[PDB]
Amino acid sequence: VRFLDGHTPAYDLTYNDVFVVPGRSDVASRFDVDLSTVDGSGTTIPVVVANMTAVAGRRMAETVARRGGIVVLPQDLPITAVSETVDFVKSRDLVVDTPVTLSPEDSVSDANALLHKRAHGAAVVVFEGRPIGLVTEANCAGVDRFARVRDIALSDFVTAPVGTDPREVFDLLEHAPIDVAVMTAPDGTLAGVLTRTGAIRAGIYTPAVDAKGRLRIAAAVGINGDVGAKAQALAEAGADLLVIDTAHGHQAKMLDAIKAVASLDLGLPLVAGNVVSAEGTRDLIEAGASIVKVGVGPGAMCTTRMMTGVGRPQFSAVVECAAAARQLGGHVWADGGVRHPRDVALALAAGASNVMIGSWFAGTYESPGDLLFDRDDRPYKESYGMASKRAVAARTAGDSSFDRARKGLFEEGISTSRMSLDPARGGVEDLLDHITSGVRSTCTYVGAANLPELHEKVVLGVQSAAGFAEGHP
Amino acid sequence: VRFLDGHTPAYDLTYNDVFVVPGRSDVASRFDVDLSTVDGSGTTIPVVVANMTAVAGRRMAETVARRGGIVVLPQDLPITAVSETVDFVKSRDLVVDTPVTLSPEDSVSDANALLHKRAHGAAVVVFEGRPIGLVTEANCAGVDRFARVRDIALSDFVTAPVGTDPREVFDLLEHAPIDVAVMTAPDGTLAGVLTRTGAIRAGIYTPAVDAKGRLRIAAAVGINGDVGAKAQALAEAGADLLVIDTAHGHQAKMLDAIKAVASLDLGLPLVAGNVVSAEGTRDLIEAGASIVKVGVGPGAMCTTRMMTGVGRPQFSAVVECAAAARQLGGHVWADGGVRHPRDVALALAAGASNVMIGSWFAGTYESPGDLLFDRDDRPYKESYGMASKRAVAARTAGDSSFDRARKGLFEEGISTSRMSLDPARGGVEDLLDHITSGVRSTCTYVGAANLPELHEKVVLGVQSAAGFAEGHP
Amino acid sequence: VRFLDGHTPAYDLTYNDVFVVPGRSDVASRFDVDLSTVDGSGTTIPVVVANMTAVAGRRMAETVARRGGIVVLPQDLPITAVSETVDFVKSRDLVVDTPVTLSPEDSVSDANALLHKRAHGAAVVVFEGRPIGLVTEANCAGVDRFARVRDIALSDFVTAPVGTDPREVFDLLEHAPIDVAVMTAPDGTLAGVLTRTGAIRAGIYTPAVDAKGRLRIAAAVGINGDVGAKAQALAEAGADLLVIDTAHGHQAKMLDAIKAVASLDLGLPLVAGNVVSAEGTRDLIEAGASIVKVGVGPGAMCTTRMMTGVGRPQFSAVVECAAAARQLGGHVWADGGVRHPRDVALALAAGASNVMIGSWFAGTYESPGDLLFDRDDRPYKESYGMASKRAVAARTAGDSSFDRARKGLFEEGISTSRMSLDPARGGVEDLLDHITSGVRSTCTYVGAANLPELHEKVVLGVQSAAGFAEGHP
Numbered sequence A, B, C: 001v002r003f004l005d006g007h008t009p010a011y012d013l014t015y016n017d018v019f020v021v022p023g024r025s026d027v028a029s030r031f032d033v034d035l036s037t038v039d040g041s042g043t044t045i046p047v048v049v050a051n052m053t054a055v056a057g058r059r060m061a062e063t064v065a066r067r068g069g070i071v072v073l074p075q076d077l078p079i080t081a082v083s084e085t086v087d088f089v090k091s092r093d094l095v096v097d098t099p100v101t102l103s104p105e106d107s108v109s110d111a112n113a114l115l116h117k118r119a120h121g122a123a124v125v126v127f128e129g130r131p132i133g134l135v136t137e138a139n140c141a142g143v144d145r146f147a148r149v150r151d152i153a154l155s156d157f158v159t160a161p162v163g164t165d166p167r168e169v170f171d172l173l174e175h176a177p178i179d180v181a182v183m184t185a186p187d188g189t190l191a192g193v194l195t196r197t198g199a200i201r202a203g204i205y206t207p208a209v210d211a212k213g214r215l216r217i218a219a220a221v222g223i224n225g226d227v228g229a230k231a232q233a234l235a236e237a238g239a240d241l242l243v244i245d246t247a248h249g250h251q252a253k254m255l256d257a258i259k260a261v262a263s264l265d266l267g268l269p270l271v272a273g274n275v276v277s278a279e280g281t282r283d284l285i286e287a288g289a290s291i292v293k294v295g296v297g298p299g300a301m302c303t304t305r306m307m308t309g310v311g312r313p314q315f316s317a318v319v320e321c322a323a324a325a326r327q328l329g330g331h332v333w334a335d336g337g338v339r340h341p342r343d344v345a346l347a348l349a350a351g352a353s354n355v356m357i358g359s360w361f362a363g364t365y366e367s368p369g370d371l372l373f374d375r376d377d378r379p380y381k382e383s384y385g386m387a388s389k390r391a392v393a394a395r396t397a398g399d400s401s402f403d404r405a406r407k408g409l410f411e412e413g414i415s416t417s418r419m420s421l422d423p424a425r426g427g428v429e430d431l432l433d434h435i436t437s438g439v440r441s442t443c444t445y446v447g448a449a450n451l452p453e454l455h456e457k458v459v460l461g462v463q464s465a466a467g468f469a470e471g472h473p
């Protein structure tokens, strides 16, 4: 990357320290920019969801993959749950979404709870697999909390067979009272739902699919235990990408795990991390990793800085590591500390092929945690860290229960953070709109038609603390 | 521009980052400074009101031009509404101001709401075009909300013929209970009003007038659609200056827009923006722009930094762009981020010929928005951005409503900020006093007698965060 | 009235002091109760809107009369304004309501301000008298404040010819996105609007109409000046009922005013007030009033108690005055202090034929005042008193500016109180539902099929401060 003349500070830079200078541009429209990645992940937008139990679930995996991202399932997820999750995602339709379903005998109180597991604003009542009506949050108000859903359900709703073009479904919903269109399978049973915004998004985002045309999903593994056997099972379970994840990636045990997995010739892209140095990036690639995950310190759930003083300002870390990886034909994932679209854009400008987002996506309907409301009625969800699941552990074979608590005494605890939902647009797809709208706008400011040109053409500069505060928050 | 020895930071500077070192001065008085601009705008003070619907209305256009500034009508204002505004502004008196007018049959409730559209402190009751009385906020207190204006109006007020010397009107109002002089035409109809402060300001500010002696006014146009026809239409409506405005000015579609307008030979100064680089300043001037508008990021309504990471600290943007425009015989407007008089002074010191002020002026009586009151009953008004009216858009001809919603999903939203009024001096002329009083003081401290001498003689320095904290807020 | 054995307190009673004891009832449902009054007012529900400028506007007069009440126009309204209000009200349809109308050239900012003049939730865009679309508050969000109505209007709306059965119009709106049906005259122009609730209300409420089938309206007159001439003009302007109104009704000047209006033999029912004594009730009836208005002290804008110590608890006042009026074949209106449906029910149980409501109805969309919002955006409007418009004043002939201020020094000021709108249901018709629903339930609890039977069969008891606190607020 190029920095403005004289911008060579005596410190490393975070996302807040830098800005992009616009260049001469012939890229007319935001939609002229190609946001697809070149690192082999298969993502059509530069967004990866972090391997965190607070974020990476079956609903998140489905929703983000349909919009071109990919979700890394958290490590130490039992292999039966992995295969169960993979089969669910890869059986999802590429356009039509999976709705919340209700029994006619479910209570209004139960319906109010389940409605916010998706962003559709309505749930479908099903009897013998067939949709019989729609349930909205409005129908649940002013009625007996334990009245049956059969009573308040709306019988009249827009329906269309699955496979109908999004533009047509969009037109059917124009004068509908409810913005949900129930999609019917060939035999008349429930296929899914498509909303007007969901139909628009189908003509904006390209789904991230495997060779069979099914949604992409990824899995992560720690460097403890038998890493080759675990990675092999994940591959056999259907994962399209593997992530070898640990807190300190520049470590002998991580180099072993990469070689053990690379030697199995699984044929999937191999991500490994995390490191913040060019030396660590090189060693991990030479061990057989095609993609290096970068980030030690910036994570929202990461207390490494205050515990150990170890860390690195993320933007500087991504610049040095992406340069090192590109010299060797590899790629870099910017992992941790992403709070705003500009963070994604700056990480791509810095040379990352993909940006990994964790805590930000906990504050969405589709994240696995329960929807909560703080003192001020504001909706939120809690993000929490993976703790010891990212740490190196000695062999617990033949471990006294004394030793179990001995090793547990020093191990990092699970910290918590409140992630509030946008009171208007609380779905993860709204944040993808947020993110990709910003990055597309960055490319038009830079003069780039795609992500490769963004990193090639970007001009960057450094600002003081008052510099970041320019504009509107 | 000269900086103190060794002040060569490794970053770009905002207005907060710099200060002016006083020089040796023989400039005797604040009033001996000449604030006229040399850029062909015609302003006699370096103040331009931004092309924003939240600020640039006809009341603002009249009031600012009479005091030497100029207002840029926002782009996409219908041409018929442009013509009414220009005709209203150019029919105003150069000394006497247009008051709020009331019918005798208006309700006290309506009168009370209309009083704050101006800063005179009284509205004039009119019958067949002639003044019959004055209405004040105090006359509206304690009366029935729907009593008629005729019952609370004062029939005793100071009156004088239009053209009376401001000095004499000032003396006629010395012992008047109401500080409003009602000015009449020879046939007795209302010509306007003049307060004691308005009489003082006539001897301080030079109106910005056209060749025919009528108040100056500008109009903005976006680079979408037919820019040439729109620009010509604005010229025929009577615009004294054209502003070709877009968020990213350094792109092909702007360069072609400037050329299409320049080749029509409309005979008006052409402004184009926004850019923040020397390369952009040169490319806009080469395409035919006479003035370059500078500012990407600093706008109080601008979310570009947080959305895209794109932007540049405004002070460094102006220094680099003013130098580039000067070598080509051009000029630079400093657009965005002005909150205090020092920002205007520093922008001029950096080499700008003129300073475009936006959201700050929304918090005035004369701005188009309604006067609001917060939880503490403080008066304020909402500023809001122009949003997609500054953005590039592909041709929308024959677009389906699906395609309309598609492009609409990613378009910039209208952000909102609250601009509080000074509970004492809430008129835009009070801000103009504030702004120009400080810019005149800056020149006396520097030793300059005019705006060019300010840029030539200024010595600047860089400070830390604590450096700005010195003094009083 | 009958009181429980031993309930003979040594004090007079407010509405909070008494409770109704259920009796044995054969009344099937609320709808079997006949709520029409027998005092000659013509109301079909026992609701009269007070003669107060904060409440009794033309929109209130139309809305309340269509639902069976009547509105008393405030005294001292110029006779020309009286005539226009009567003509407007008497030209309204008995079923279809008058909507808020907008031009396509109106601003969005003016649109959502005019929307709250009615409870429909939509305004009708009119082009040459023909309905071309609807504007909702949702359409005003997210667009430029000064955009035109043309840009946000919805061209799709349910329409039907005026005179269509309310049940049919109700069905046409079942699946409509907007709950407003645009009613058209045979030539296609806008006849009015009807909502699903508006159609329902047409089957519950009987419009209060004159002999020609036009909506009823009343007007008030003070006892100063030439009362006979004032009352004659109000009758010729079309008033269906006259209210002679003064703070202290038991005085010689009021008795003279009644005899002067009675001797004109205008043929209209004559209300006179206010008194709280049996002797006052008899003297006003014997002077020629057919209805005595009862209430000194309880009005929400009334500061009589704190200024003078004069006043009477309203329940005992009504009980004593209704009984005295009954012996002379007259009727009593309960004027002042109504805050809840219970107060209406208790006033009727006490023997009032009608209940006058003031400040409570100021907190509705249809009241004349502007809609306001407090610190928390909670909607409200201000109610204010009529003050000196209810007071005796000597002839102002030969009044020096000194004499005007002498009499104004002791004049009653205009008291103010904030009446909050119910955030769910802000129209006055929803309060009519609230009021008449409770009064109908009171009748079924007492076993009465109508208002006379309510007063004949009711059993009352007295409670302490803790007794009122029973139940839910």
Ligand SMILES: Nc1ncnc2c1ncn2[C@@H]1O[C@H](COP(=O)(O)OP(=O)(O)OP(=O)(O)O)[C@@H](O)[C@H]1O
Pocket (backbone or CB within 6 Å): A052, A053, A054, A055, A056, A057, A058, A059, A060, A074, A077, A078, A081, A085, A117, A367, A368, A369
């Ligand atoms: N057997 C398991 N052991 C440990 N963690 C599990 C197991 N099964 C699921 N999880 C975790 O529980 C969370 C819930 O995700 P999961 O995929 O089960 O569903 P989801 O996306 O929340 O959707 P739904 O609400 O429909 O179940 C995730 O963090 C997942 O990793």
Ligand SMILES: Nc1ncnc2c1ncn2[C@@H]1O[C@H](COP(=O)(O)OP(=O)(O)OP(=O)(O)O)[C@@H](O)[C@H]1O
Pocket (backbone or CB within 6 Å): B052, B053, B054, B055, B056, B057, B058, B059, B060, B074, B077, B078, B081, B085, B117, B366, B367, B368, B369, C146, C147, C148
């Ligand atoms: N026809 C129109 N279409 C869109 N915007 C308009 C139109 N007419 C005016 N505006 C906008 O409305 C705002 C106020 O315009 P106007 O000319 O009324 O100014 P003003 O000073 O507020 O005048 P006044 O207060 O006397 O009505 C400005 O933002 C202007 O751009």
Ligand SMILES: Nc1ncnc2c1ncn2[C@@H]1O[C@H](COP(=O)(O)OP(=O)(O)OP(=O)(O)O)[C@@H](O)[C@H]1O
Pocket (backbone or CB within 6 Å): B146, B147, B148, C052, C053, C054, C055, C056, C057, C058, C059, C074, C077, C078, C081, C085, C117, C368
């Ligand atoms: N000429 C007048 N003098 C004094 N008070 C008046 C006069 N005309 C109307 N009012 C008062 O103004 C209030 C509103 O009256 P009305 O509803 O007729 O006004 P409007 O302006 O036609 O209504 P809207 O706000 O619905 O347009 C009432 O309190 C009424 O008594």
Ligand SMILES: Nc1nc2c(ncn2[C@@H]2O[C@H](COP(=O)(O)O)[C@@H](O)[C@H]2O)c(=O)[nH]1
Pocket (backbone or CB within 6 Å): A050, A051, A052, A247, A274, A295, A298, A299, A300, A301, A302, A303, A304, A335, A336, A337, A338, A356, A357, A358, A359, A360, A384, A385, A386, A387, A388, A390, A414, A415
């Ligand atoms: N130190 C630490 N880092 C964590 C933990 N859980 C996740 N992380 C890191 O933080 C990243 C997410 O960053 P975020 O998007 O929340 O800023 C993860 O991808 C991972 O690299 C944890 O418990 N401790």
Ligand SMILES: Nc1nc2c(ncn2[C@@H]2O[C@H](COP(=O)(O)O)[C@@H](O)[C@H]2O)c(=O)[nH]1
Pocket (backbone or CB within 6 Å): B050, B051, B052, B247, B274, B295, B298, B299, B300, B301, B302, B303, B304, B335, B336, B337, B338, B356, B357, B358, B359, B360, B384, B385, B386, B387, B388, B390, B414, B415
């Ligand atoms: N990005 C962006 N810039 C805006 C918007 N509205 C106005 N601006 C810019 O900000 C300037 C005004 O800045 P202000 O004086 O309000 O800080 C305008 O002249 C224009 O250049 C908007 O919605 N978005």
Ligand SMILES: Nc1nc2c(ncn2[C@@H]2O[C@H](COP(=O)(O)O)[C@@H](O)[C@H]2O)c(=O)[nH]1
Pocket (backbone or CB within 6 Å): C050, C051, C052, C247, C274, C295, C298, C299, C300, C301, C302, C303, C304, C335, C336, C337, C338, C356, C357, C358, C359, C360, C384, C385, C386, C387, C388, C390, C414, C415
């Ligand atoms: N003392 C007094 N009574 C008033 C005033 N305005 C209205 N009233 C009385 O109060 C009644 C309304 O009572 P409310 O329904 O507001 O409690 C009116 O009908 C009238 O009798 C005022 O300013 N002073």
